[PDB]
Structures are given as structure tokens and as C-alpha cells.
RNA sequence: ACGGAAACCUUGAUUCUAACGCUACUUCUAAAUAA
């Protein structure tokens, strides 16, 4: 993810709702082991350590994201996900279909 | 110059009539956490 970063709203909110601290973790099947085995499992290399746990939740609906920033040629700072893009989106498919019994 | 000679245990008769390999059932569910 590069055109997006973590928001600091939704940052504080894990870091003062102490959701790191209630970490929970996973064998490679994907299914909820203590930390004990985990630990036994990363050792042995049955359990990937980097994909293998989760930071519990974060209360309240917050957005996760923001947008990424960026500088252009003029020293401005841009948001990373506009611009240029390219031009192709033709108009629509008109269908026709003028026989179709709409229910009400 | 045999208690001997001549005599088919033979004739016809469907192991046949009726009966659903049948009943319910979406090749489908879950996307966390990090960035």
C-alpha cells in the first residue's frame, strides 16, 4: 500500500485502547492457538511469524485509512491517488429491453 | 429247442401374473489483523 497511509486518528485509537496488548495468534491452518504454541510453532517453523496474529479490534468505526501525499515538480504537495490516471470509459450499454413487466 | 417270443414308463403342460432404485438436498460459507 503505498497511495495510502494509516490514519493517526484510527492510530490512537489502538494505541490507547490497548489493542496490541491483546494480540491473538494462529497456526498456519489459520485457527486460534495460545501464545505458548505459537511461540513452539514459529521455533520449529511450522507457523510463519509474520502472518500468524492479529491486534484484536478497534472499537468505534473509525476510517483506518488516509490518503498518502506526495510532491509535484512545482514543491506543491498533491494527494498520491489523483492525477493524469488515464481516458478510457466509453459512455454505457444501452440495453433497450422496453418489454420487461416491472413489478411496482 | 433258455417260464421262453413280441412291449419306449410314453402322450400333452411358458416357474407364469402385479411392482418407478424412489424420497428431501443452491458445489457452497468465512476476509480478521497489519500496511
Not at 16 to 32: C, I, L, P, V, W
Amino acid at each position: 500500500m503505498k497511495n495510502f497511509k494509516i490514519s493517526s486518528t484510527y492510530r490512537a485509537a489502538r494505541k490507547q485502547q490497548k489493542t496490541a496488548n491483546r494480540k491473538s495468534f494462529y497456526n498456519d491452518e489459520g485457527y486460534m492457538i495460545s501464545p505458548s504454541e505459537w511461540a513452539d510453532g514459529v521455533i520449529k517453523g511450522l507457523i510463519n511469524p509474520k502472518n500468524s496474529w492479529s491486534n484484536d479490534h478497534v472499537k468505534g468505526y473509525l476510517p483506518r485509512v488516509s490518503p498518502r501525499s506526495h510532491w509535484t515538480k512545482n514543491g506543491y504537495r498533491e494527494y498520491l491517488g489523483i492525477g493524469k490516471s488515464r481516458d478510457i470509459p466509453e459512455k454505457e450499454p444501452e440495453v433497450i429491453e422496453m418489454m420487461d413487466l416491472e413489478l411496482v
